[PDB]
mmCIF file of N, CA and C and ligand atoms in Angstrom:
data_model
loop_
_atom_site.group_PDB
_atom_site.id
_atom_site.type_symbol
_atom_site.label_atom_id
_atom_site.label_comp_id
_atom_site.label_asym_id
_atom_site.label_seq_id
_atom_site.Cartn_x
_atom_site.Cartn_y
_atom_site.Cartn_z
ATOM 1 N N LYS A 298 11.586 1.701 5.027
ATOM 2 C CA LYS A 298 10.648 2.257 4.821
ATOM 3 C C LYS A 298 11.551 3.518 6.157
ATOM 4 N N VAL A 299 12.218 4.852 6.018
ATOM 5 C CA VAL A 299 12.404 5.683 6.933
ATOM 6 C C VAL A 299 11.552 5.955 6.563
ATOM 7 N N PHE A 300 10.642 7.444 7.170
ATOM 8 C CA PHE A 300 9.594 7.979 7.071
ATOM 9 C C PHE A 300 10.481 9.599 7.481
ATOM 10 N N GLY A 301 9.860 10.637 6.271
ATOM 11 C CA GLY A 301 10.492 11.518 6.978
ATOM 12 C C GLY A 301 9.333 11.962 7.544
ATOM 13 N N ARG A 302 9.430 13.568 8.972
ATOM 14 C CA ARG A 302 8.491 14.105 9.552
ATOM 15 C C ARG A 302 7.423 14.012 9.265
ATOM 16 N N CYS A 303 7.294 14.925 8.130
ATOM 17 C CA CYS A 303 5.988 15.575 7.946
ATOM 18 C C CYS A 303 5.372 14.245 6.884
ATOM 19 N N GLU A 304 5.958 13.802 5.944
ATOM 20 C CA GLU A 304 5.457 12.213 5.547
ATOM 21 C C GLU A 304 4.543 11.546 6.024
ATOM 22 N N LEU A 305 5.144 11.322 7.589
ATOM 23 C CA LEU A 305 4.771 10.458 8.502
ATOM 24 C C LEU A 305 3.030 11.181 8.975
ATOM 25 N N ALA A 306 3.244 11.997 9.590
ATOM 26 C CA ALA A 306 2.208 12.989 10.113
ATOM 27 C C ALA A 306 1.093 13.355 8.977
ATOM 28 N N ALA A 307 1.455 13.085 8.031
ATOM 29 C CA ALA A 307 0.431 12.898 6.575
ATOM 30 C C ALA A 307 -0.495 11.430 6.650
ATOM 31 N N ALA A 308 0.399 10.388 6.544
ATOM 32 C CA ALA A 308 0.350 8.974 6.270
ATOM 33 C C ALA A 308 -0.835 8.914 7.971
ATOM 34 N N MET A 309 -0.235 9.392 8.895
ATOM 35 C CA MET A 309 -0.956 9.030 10.472
ATOM 36 C C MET A 309 -2.709 9.907 10.164
ATOM 37 N N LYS A 310 -2.609 10.732 9.459
ATOM 38 C CA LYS A 310 -3.809 11.519 9.660
ATOM 39 C C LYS A 310 -4.676 11.171 8.493
ATOM 40 N N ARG A 311 -4.163 10.562 7.199
ATOM 41 C CA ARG A 311 -5.015 9.738 6.913
ATOM 42 C C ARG A 311 -5.619 8.484 7.624
ATOM 43 N N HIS A 312 -5.001 7.809 7.964
ATOM 44 C CA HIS A 312 -5.418 6.611 8.787
ATOM 45 C C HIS A 312 -6.224 7.003 10.066
ATOM 46 N N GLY A 313 -6.673 8.390 10.251
ATOM 47 C CA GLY A 313 -7.348 8.661 11.663
ATOM 48 C C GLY A 313 -6.986 8.807 13.486
ATOM 49 N N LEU A 314 -5.396 8.790 13.060
ATOM 50 C CA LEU A 314 -5.163 9.285 14.315
ATOM 51 C C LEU A 314 -4.802 10.918 14.933
ATOM 52 N N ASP A 315 -5.558 11.460 14.152
ATOM 53 C CA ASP A 315 -5.683 13.033 14.574
ATOM 54 C C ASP A 315 -6.739 12.515 15.629
ATOM 55 N N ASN A 316 -6.402 12.738 16.953
ATOM 56 C CA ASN A 316 -7.011 13.662 18.255
ATOM 57 C C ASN A 316 -7.807 11.690 17.867
ATOM 58 N N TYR A 317 -7.295 11.441 18.096
ATOM 59 C CA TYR A 317 -7.840 9.823 18.421
ATOM 60 C C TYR A 317 -7.628 8.820 19.286
ATOM 61 N N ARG A 318 -8.511 9.166 20.512
ATOM 62 C CA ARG A 318 -8.909 8.901 22.040
ATOM 63 C C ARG A 318 -8.718 10.369 22.794
ATOM 64 N N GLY A 319 -8.359 11.933 22.122
ATOM 65 C CA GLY A 319 -7.022 12.846 22.619
ATOM 66 C C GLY A 319 -5.885 12.905 22.550
ATOM 67 N N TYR A 320 -5.804 12.387 21.726
ATOM 68 C CA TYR A 320 -3.986 12.298 21.360
ATOM 69 C C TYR A 320 -4.403 13.278 19.896
ATOM 70 N N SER A 321 -3.617 14.504 19.609
ATOM 71 C CA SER A 321 -3.639 15.527 18.770
ATOM 72 C C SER A 321 -2.656 14.743 17.985
ATOM 73 N N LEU A 322 -2.152 14.880 16.771
ATOM 74 C CA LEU A 322 -1.378 14.662 15.674
ATOM 75 C C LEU A 322 0.261 14.008 16.569
ATOM 76 N N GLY A 323 0.789 15.229 16.667
ATOM 77 C CA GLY A 323 1.442 15.514 17.676
ATOM 78 C C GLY A 323 2.259 14.334 18.091
ATOM 79 N N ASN A 324 1.161 14.345 19.260
ATOM 80 C CA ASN A 324 2.722 13.339 20.046
ATOM 81 C C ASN A 324 2.389 12.360 19.294
ATOM 82 N N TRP A 325 1.454 11.444 18.437
ATOM 83 C CA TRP A 325 2.153 10.338 17.426
ATOM 84 C C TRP A 325 2.828 10.488 16.419
ATOM 85 N N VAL A 326 3.156 11.571 16.471
ATOM 86 C CA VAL A 326 4.969 11.458 15.526
ATOM 87 C C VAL A 326 5.715 11.448 16.334
ATOM 88 N N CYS A 327 5.695 12.516 17.992
ATOM 89 C CA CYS A 327 6.733 12.166 18.590
ATOM 90 C C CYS A 327 7.129 10.989 18.849
ATOM 91 N N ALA A 328 5.842 10.096 19.412
ATOM 92 C CA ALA A 328 6.349 8.721 19.401
ATOM 93 C C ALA A 328 7.057 8.016 18.778
ATOM 94 N N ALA A 329 6.218 8.236 17.689
ATOM 95 C CA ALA A 329 6.932 6.923 16.101
ATOM 96 C C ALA A 329 9.201 7.407 16.339
ATOM 97 N N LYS A 330 9.149 8.854 16.350
ATOM 98 C CA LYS A 330 10.831 9.258 16.171
ATOM 99 C C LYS A 330 11.249 9.127 17.535
ATOM 100 N N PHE A 331 10.901 9.071 18.812
ATOM 101 C CA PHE A 331 11.769 8.574 19.858
ATOM 102 C C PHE A 331 11.734 6.390 19.902
ATOM 103 N N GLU A 332 10.321 6.077 19.197
ATOM 104 C CA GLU A 332 10.646 4.260 19.753
ATOM 105 C C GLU A 332 11.275 4.292 18.437
ATOM 106 N N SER A 333 11.309 4.742 17.484
ATOM 107 C CA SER A 333 11.615 3.796 15.926
ATOM 108 C C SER A 333 12.333 4.391 15.017
ATOM 109 N N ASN A 334 12.787 5.932 15.380
ATOM 110 C CA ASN A 334 13.130 7.143 14.729
ATOM 111 C C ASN A 334 12.671 7.043 13.108
ATOM 112 N N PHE A 335 11.419 6.860 13.494
ATOM 113 C CA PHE A 335 10.515 6.639 12.333
ATOM 114 C C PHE A 335 11.053 5.511 10.683
ATOM 115 N N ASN A 336 11.518 4.712 11.451
ATOM 116 C CA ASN A 336 11.939 3.077 10.561
ATOM 117 C C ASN A 336 11.263 1.812 10.486
ATOM 118 N N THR A 337 9.791 2.016 9.900
ATOM 119 C CA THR A 337 9.444 1.021 9.884
ATOM 120 C C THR A 337 9.879 -0.717 9.993
ATOM 121 N N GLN A 338 11.560 -0.347 9.763
ATOM 122 C CA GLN A 338 11.904 -2.346 9.929
ATOM 123 C C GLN A 338 12.383 -1.812 11.451
ATOM 124 N N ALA A 339 12.290 -1.418 12.275
ATOM 125 C CA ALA A 339 12.964 -1.289 13.283
ATOM 126 C C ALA A 339 12.204 -2.349 14.452
ATOM 127 N N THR A 340 13.492 -3.368 14.528
ATOM 128 C CA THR A 340 12.800 -4.422 15.629
ATOM 129 C C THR A 340 14.187 -4.380 17.119
ATOM 130 N N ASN A 341 13.270 -4.556 18.107
ATOM 131 C CA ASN A 341 14.208 -3.964 19.353
ATOM 132 C C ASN A 341 13.689 -5.810 20.686
ATOM 133 N N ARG A 342 14.594 -7.047 20.884
ATOM 134 C CA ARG A 342 14.312 -7.500 21.826
ATOM 135 C C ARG A 342 14.350 -7.368 23.350
ATOM 136 N N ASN A 343 13.105 -7.654 24.043
ATOM 137 C CA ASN A 343 13.091 -7.055 25.343
ATOM 138 C C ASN A 343 13.686 -8.090 26.211
ATOM 139 N N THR A 344 13.936 -8.294 27.696
ATOM 140 C CA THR A 344 14.263 -8.830 28.397
ATOM 141 C C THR A 344 13.600 -10.532 29.107
ATOM 142 N N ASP A 345 12.151 -10.160 28.676
ATOM 143 C CA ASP A 345 11.740 -10.943 29.138
ATOM 144 C C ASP A 345 11.595 -12.474 27.548
ATOM 145 N N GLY A 346 12.223 -12.056 26.798
ATOM 146 C CA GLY A 346 12.570 -13.009 25.889
ATOM 147 C C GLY A 346 11.353 -12.115 24.409
ATOM 148 N N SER A 347 10.384 -11.547 24.660
ATOM 149 C CA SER A 347 9.578 -10.429 23.706
ATOM 150 C C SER A 347 10.136 -9.389 22.761
ATOM 151 N N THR A 348 9.939 -9.131 21.482
ATOM 152 C CA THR A 348 10.304 -7.735 20.506
ATOM 153 C C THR A 348 9.576 -7.532 20.294
ATOM 154 N N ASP A 349 9.712 -6.196 20.617
ATOM 155 C CA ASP A 349 8.574 -5.025 19.834
ATOM 156 C C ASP A 349 8.732 -4.707 18.172
ATOM 157 N N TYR A 350 7.889 -4.634 17.384
ATOM 158 C CA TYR A 350 8.283 -4.393 16.112
ATOM 159 C C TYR A 350 7.723 -3.325 15.556
ATOM 160 N N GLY A 351 8.389 -2.619 14.446
ATOM 161 C CA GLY A 351 7.976 -1.261 13.718
ATOM 162 C C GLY A 351 8.069 0.509 14.187
ATOM 163 N N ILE A 352 7.244 0.613 13.655
ATOM 164 C CA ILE A 352 7.430 2.403 13.780
ATOM 165 C C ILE A 352 6.264 2.686 14.790
ATOM 166 N N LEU A 353 5.981 1.814 16.008
ATOM 167 C CA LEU A 353 5.304 2.203 17.028
ATOM 168 C C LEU A 353 6.063 1.267 17.943
ATOM 169 N N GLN A 354 6.897 0.345 17.466
ATOM 170 C CA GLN A 354 7.427 -0.992 18.470
ATOM 171 C C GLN A 354 6.381 -1.568 19.261
ATOM 172 N N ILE A 355 5.155 -2.136 18.789
ATOM 173 C CA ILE A 355 4.517 -2.850 18.962
ATOM 174 C C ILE A 355 4.626 -3.954 19.982
ATOM 175 N N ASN A 356 5.023 -4.605 20.384
ATOM 176 C CA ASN A 356 5.421 -6.107 21.827
ATOM 177 C C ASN A 356 4.568 -6.873 21.375
ATOM 178 N N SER A 357 5.440 -8.167 20.947
ATOM 179 C CA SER A 357 5.132 -9.723 20.974
ATOM 180 C C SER A 357 4.594 -10.350 22.426
ATOM 181 N N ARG A 358 4.159 -9.528 22.970
ATOM 182 C CA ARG A 358 4.097 -10.332 24.279
ATOM 183 C C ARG A 358 2.582 -9.779 24.872
ATOM 184 N N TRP A 359 1.759 -9.505 23.807
ATOM 185 C CA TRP A 359 0.684 -8.913 23.834
ATOM 186 C C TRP A 359 0.042 -8.672 22.969
ATOM 187 N N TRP A 360 0.566 -7.987 21.706
ATOM 188 C CA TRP A 360 -0.146 -7.504 20.459
ATOM 189 C C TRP A 360 -0.593 -8.044 18.876
ATOM 190 N N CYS A 361 0.813 -9.177 19.266
ATOM 191 C CA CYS A 361 1.104 -9.567 17.474
ATOM 192 C C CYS A 361 1.870 -10.948 17.760
ATOM 193 N N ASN A 362 1.679 -11.739 16.840
ATOM 194 C CA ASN A 362 2.452 -13.118 17.044
ATOM 195 C C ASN A 362 4.072 -13.042 16.136
ATOM 196 N N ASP A 363 4.460 -13.667 16.731
ATOM 197 C CA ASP A 363 6.590 -13.537 15.955
ATOM 198 C C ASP A 363 6.472 -15.277 16.154
ATOM 199 N N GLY A 364 5.947 -16.150 16.848
ATOM 200 C CA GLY A 364 5.961 -17.537 16.663
ATOM 201 C C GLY A 364 6.975 -17.864 18.132
ATOM 202 N N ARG A 365 7.729 -16.994 18.776
ATOM 203 C CA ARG A 365 8.840 -17.161 19.515
ATOM 204 C C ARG A 365 8.743 -16.649 20.882
ATOM 205 N N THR A 366 7.515 -16.068 21.324
ATOM 206 C CA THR A 366 6.625 -15.968 22.517
ATOM 207 C C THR A 366 6.252 -16.675 23.354
ATOM 208 N N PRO A 367 6.906 -17.542 24.013
ATOM 209 C CA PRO A 367 6.176 -18.754 24.783
ATOM 210 C C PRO A 367 4.979 -17.860 25.782
ATOM 211 N N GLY A 368 3.357 -18.171 25.789
ATOM 212 C CA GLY A 368 2.523 -18.122 26.495
ATOM 213 C C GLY A 368 2.136 -16.190 26.411
ATOM 214 N N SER A 369 2.219 -15.908 25.243
ATOM 215 C CA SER A 369 2.119 -14.183 24.628
ATOM 216 C C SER A 369 1.151 -14.589 24.251
ATOM 217 N N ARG A 370 0.141 -13.065 23.571
ATOM 218 C CA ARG A 370 -1.417 -13.382 23.140
ATOM 219 C C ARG A 370 -1.177 -12.607 22.284
ATOM 220 N N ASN A 371 -1.933 -12.314 21.203
ATOM 221 C CA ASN A 371 -1.976 -11.444 19.549
ATOM 222 C C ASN A 371 -2.975 -10.797 19.842
ATOM 223 N N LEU A 372 -3.386 -9.820 20.193
ATOM 224 C CA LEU A 372 -4.280 -8.981 20.698
ATOM 225 C C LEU A 372 -4.843 -8.365 19.609
ATOM 226 N N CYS A 373 -4.082 -8.177 18.197
ATOM 227 C CA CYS A 373 -4.468 -6.904 17.281
ATOM 228 C C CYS A 373 -4.770 -8.823 15.727
ATOM 229 N N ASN A 374 -4.330 -9.432 16.475
ATOM 230 C CA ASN A 374 -5.066 -10.624 15.651
ATOM 231 C C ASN A 374 -3.938 -10.737 14.350
ATOM 232 N N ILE A 375 -2.820 -10.307 14.379
ATOM 233 C CA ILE A 375 -1.826 -9.723 13.343
ATOM 234 C C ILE A 375 -0.349 -10.839 13.230
ATOM 235 N N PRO A 376 0.435 -11.259 12.450
ATOM 236 C CA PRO A 376 2.040 -11.689 12.496
ATOM 237 C C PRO A 376 3.236 -10.462 12.802
ATOM 238 N N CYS A 377 3.428 -10.352 14.088
ATOM 239 C CA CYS A 377 4.571 -9.411 14.018
ATOM 240 C C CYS A 377 5.244 -8.316 12.885
ATOM 241 N N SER A 378 5.697 -9.698 11.813
ATOM 242 C CA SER A 378 5.901 -9.546 10.602
ATOM 243 C C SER A 378 5.313 -8.065 10.106
ATOM 244 N N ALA A 379 3.905 -7.869 10.007
ATOM 245 C CA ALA A 379 3.442 -7.243 9.478
ATOM 246 C C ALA A 379 3.581 -6.209 9.703
ATOM 247 N N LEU A 380 3.480 -5.339 11.108
ATOM 248 C CA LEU A 380 3.962 -4.486 11.134
ATOM 249 C C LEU A 380 5.378 -3.550 11.117
ATOM 250 N N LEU A 381 6.081 -3.808 10.348
ATOM 251 C CA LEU A 381 7.173 -3.865 9.143
ATOM 252 C C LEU A 381 7.455 -3.601 8.169
ATOM 253 N N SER A 382 5.708 -3.694 7.713
ATOM 254 C CA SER A 382 5.592 -3.406 6.379
ATOM 255 C C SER A 382 5.542 -1.853 6.064
ATOM 256 N N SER A 383 6.509 -1.128 5.160
ATOM 257 C CA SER A 383 6.299 0.472 4.303
ATOM 258 C C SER A 383 5.011 0.873 4.074
ATOM 259 N N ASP A 384 3.661 0.313 5.015
ATOM 260 C CA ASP A 384 2.825 0.866 4.758
ATOM 261 C C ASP A 384 2.089 0.260 5.882
ATOM 262 N N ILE A 385 1.763 2.090 6.830
ATOM 263 C CA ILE A 385 1.546 1.238 8.108
ATOM 264 C C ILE A 385 0.351 0.711 8.141
ATOM 265 N N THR A 386 -0.402 0.898 7.261
ATOM 266 C CA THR A 386 -1.798 0.751 8.335
ATOM 267 C C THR A 386 -2.161 -0.147 9.829
ATOM 268 N N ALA A 387 -1.231 -2.054 9.048
ATOM 269 C CA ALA A 387 -1.125 -2.473 10.026
ATOM 270 C C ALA A 387 -1.027 -2.071 11.595
ATOM 271 N N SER A 388 0.319 -1.356 11.577
ATOM 272 C CA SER A 388 0.504 -0.407 12.668
ATOM 273 C C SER A 388 -0.523 -0.023 13.300
ATOM 274 N N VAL A 389 -0.951 1.414 12.268
ATOM 275 C CA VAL A 389 -2.099 2.218 13.368
ATOM 276 C C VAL A 389 -3.230 1.051 13.310
ATOM 277 N N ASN A 390 -3.610 0.524 12.770
ATOM 278 C CA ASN A 390 -4.724 -0.192 13.147
ATOM 279 C C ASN A 390 -4.891 -1.333 14.632
ATOM 280 N N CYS A 391 -3.209 -1.406 14.953
ATOM 281 C CA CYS A 391 -3.120 -1.960 16.441
ATOM 282 C C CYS A 391 -2.827 -0.671 16.673
ATOM 283 N N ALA A 392 -2.068 0.137 16.983
ATOM 284 C CA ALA A 392 -1.950 1.351 17.871
ATOM 285 C C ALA A 392 -3.225 2.094 18.469
ATOM 286 N N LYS A 393 -4.148 2.163 17.740
ATOM 287 C CA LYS A 393 -5.127 2.212 18.540
ATOM 288 C C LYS A 393 -6.569 0.993 19.113
ATOM 289 N N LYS A 394 -6.056 0.217 18.885
ATOM 290 C CA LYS A 394 -6.694 -0.824 19.956
ATOM 291 C C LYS A 394 -5.256 -0.789 21.558
ATOM 292 N N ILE A 395 -4.378 -0.704 21.555
ATOM 293 C CA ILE A 395 -3.259 -0.371 22.444
ATOM 294 C C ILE A 395 -3.771 0.679 23.001
ATOM 295 N N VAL A 396 -4.264 1.768 22.468
ATOM 296 C CA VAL A 396 -4.193 3.128 22.992
ATOM 297 C C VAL A 396 -5.683 3.291 23.576
ATOM 298 N N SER A 397 -6.407 2.709 23.496
ATOM 299 C CA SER A 397 -7.729 2.172 24.016
ATOM 300 C C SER A 397 -8.525 1.121 25.218
ATOM 301 N N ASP A 398 -7.012 0.658 25.607
ATOM 302 C CA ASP A 398 -7.468 -0.137 26.489
ATOM 303 C C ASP A 398 -7.310 0.095 28.206
ATOM 304 N N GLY A 399 -6.949 1.487 27.842
ATOM 305 C CA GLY A 399 -7.165 2.285 29.549
ATOM 306 C C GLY A 399 -6.355 2.915 29.626
ATOM 307 N N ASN A 400 -4.948 2.315 29.849
ATOM 308 C CA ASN A 400 -3.723 3.252 29.527
ATOM 309 C C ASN A 400 -3.220 4.245 29.031
ATOM 310 N N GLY A 401 -4.023 4.502 27.968
ATOM 311 C CA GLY A 401 -3.483 5.445 26.639
ATOM 312 C C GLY A 401 -2.407 5.770 26.440
ATOM 313 N N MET A 402 -1.375 6.468 25.858
ATOM 314 C CA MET A 402 -0.228 6.479 25.426
ATOM 315 C C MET A 402 0.771 6.045 25.921
ATOM 316 N N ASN A 403 0.646 6.257 27.577
ATOM 317 C CA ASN A 403 1.166 5.309 28.614
ATOM 318 C C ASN A 403 2.300 4.513 28.239
ATOM 319 N N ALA A 404 1.582 3.602 26.963
ATOM 320 C CA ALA A 404 1.600 2.196 26.737
ATOM 321 C C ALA A 404 3.139 2.223 26.038
ATOM 322 N N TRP A 405 3.594 3.526 26.151
ATOM 323 C CA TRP A 405 4.946 4.006 25.003
ATOM 324 C C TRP A 405 5.435 4.185 26.030
ATOM 325 N N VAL A 406 6.615 3.234 26.591
ATOM 326 C CA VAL A 406 7.884 4.194 27.550
ATOM 327 C C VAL A 406 8.411 5.069 27.180
ATOM 328 N N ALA A 407 8.637 5.628 25.369
ATOM 329 C CA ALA A 407 9.154 6.473 24.972
ATOM 330 C C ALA A 407 8.323 7.993 24.834
ATOM 331 N N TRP A 408 7.114 7.524 25.076
ATOM 332 C CA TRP A 408 6.394 8.620 24.805
ATOM 333 C C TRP A 408 6.591 9.019 26.142
ATOM 334 N N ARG A 409 6.081 8.303 27.138
ATOM 335 C CA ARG A 409 5.431 8.467 28.127
ATOM 336 C C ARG A 409 7.292 9.593 28.681
ATOM 337 N N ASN A 410 8.329 9.024 28.656
ATOM 338 C CA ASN A 410 9.559 9.503 28.876
ATOM 339 C C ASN A 410 10.061 11.203 28.405
ATOM 340 N N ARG A 411 9.324 11.423 26.735
ATOM 341 C CA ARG A 411 9.946 11.970 25.958
ATOM 342 C C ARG A 411 9.181 13.010 25.133
ATOM 343 N N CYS A 412 8.157 12.409 25.201
ATOM 344 C CA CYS A 412 6.714 13.239 25.189
ATOM 345 C C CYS A 412 6.021 13.904 25.875
ATOM 346 N N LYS A 413 5.474 12.900 26.415
ATOM 347 C CA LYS A 413 4.584 14.227 27.793
ATOM 348 C C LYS A 413 4.789 15.128 28.129
ATOM 349 N N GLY A 414 4.064 15.839 27.886
ATOM 350 C CA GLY A 414 4.278 17.079 28.972
ATOM 351 C C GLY A 414 4.880 18.080 28.020
ATOM 352 N N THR A 415 5.330 17.718 26.899
ATOM 353 C CA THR A 415 6.030 18.015 26.190
ATOM 354 C C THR A 415 5.128 19.230 24.912
ATOM 355 N N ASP A 416 6.101 20.201 24.710
ATOM 356 C CA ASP A 416 4.834 20.936 23.075
ATOM 357 C C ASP A 416 5.495 19.744 21.596
ATOM 358 N N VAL A 417 4.022 18.878 22.182
ATOM 359 C CA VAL A 417 4.109 17.740 20.757
ATOM 360 C C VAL A 417 3.664 18.958 19.109
ATOM 361 N N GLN A 418 3.044 20.173 19.420
ATOM 362 C CA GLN A 418 2.647 20.184 18.422
ATOM 363 C C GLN A 418 3.739 20.560 17.392
ATOM 364 N N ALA A 419 5.118 20.819 18.053
ATOM 365 C CA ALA A 419 6.124 21.079 17.123
ATOM 366 C C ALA A 419 6.418 19.971 16.497
ATOM 367 N N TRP A 420 5.972 18.960 16.929
ATOM 368 C CA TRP A 420 6.228 17.422 15.573
ATOM 369 C C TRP A 420 5.820 17.769 14.574
ATOM 370 N N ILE A 421 4.865 18.679 14.343
ATOM 371 C CA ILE A 421 4.152 18.904 12.745
ATOM 372 C C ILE A 421 4.120 20.628 11.826
ATOM 373 N N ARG A 422 5.033 21.277 13.410
ATOM 374 C CA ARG A 422 5.401 22.327 12.484
ATOM 375 C C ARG A 422 5.883 22.696 10.920
ATOM 376 N N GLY A 423 4.570 23.011 10.243
ATOM 377 C CA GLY A 423 5.474 23.589 9.082
ATOM 378 C C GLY A 423 4.958 22.544 7.924
ATOM 379 N N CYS A 424 4.128 21.214 8.278
ATOM 380 C CA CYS A 424 3.713 20.312 7.494
ATOM 381 C C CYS A 424 2.334 20.718 6.945
ATOM 382 N N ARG A 425 2.457 20.693 5.375
ATOM 383 C CA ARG A 425 1.226 20.623 4.648
ATOM 384 C C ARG A 425 0.146 19.483 5.406
ATOM 385 N N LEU A 426 -0.588 19.609 5.937
ATOM 386 C CA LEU A 426 -2.048 18.333 6.828
ATOM 387 C C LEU A 426 -3.169 18.555 6.466
HETATM 388 CL CL1 LIG B 159 -6.207 9.086 27.769
HETATM 389 NA NA1 LIG B 160 2.516 -12.875 21.592
#
C-alpha cells in the first residue's frame, strides 16, 4: 500500500505515535516519506547483508527475522515480512521499541539527515487529525 501523507498521519496518530518519546507526529511522517516514500512494500539491501523492511525501513540486523541475516537478533520478535503489511501496526509497535533504545530517532538515517532540525510540522499541515 502506498499511503497518502494525511492518511498516514492519521494512521500513526491512532497507533499512538504522536509525541511518542517526545517526537511530534511530523517527525514520523517525514521519516516515512524519506525512508520508503510512504510505501509499505519497500525493501532495501545493506552492504553487510542485512535488509531494511517497510514503511520505516526496519533493519533485519537487529529488529526482525528474515532467515537470511546470519548472527542477527530479532528484538521485535517478528518475521520481517510482517513489516510489509498494508496494516502498519507491526511497524509502529517495532518502531516504538527502536526509538526507546537510547538513540531516539537518530536510528533512522534519513530522519537524521533530512528531517531533524527542519520544520516537521509542515508534514501534517492541512490534515484532518
Ligand atoms: Cl530522544
Ligand atoms: Na534478524
